[PDB]
Design a protein around this nucleic acid. Structure first.
Length: 16
RNA sequence: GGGCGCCGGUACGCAAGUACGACGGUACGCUCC
């Protein structure tokens, strides 16, 4: 499995 | 191009990491023309 991330899949990121 | 996974680079760091909707994708692994 690849490295563990935090900021999600772009689609989610609404309000800056 | 976009999705899902994820990442760059931004924090933090000794450098790689681990954070992180800093703010930018979709590269690279699959999927749809």
């Amino acid at each position: 499995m690849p490295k563990t991330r935090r900021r999600p899949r772009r689609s989610q990121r609404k309000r800056p």
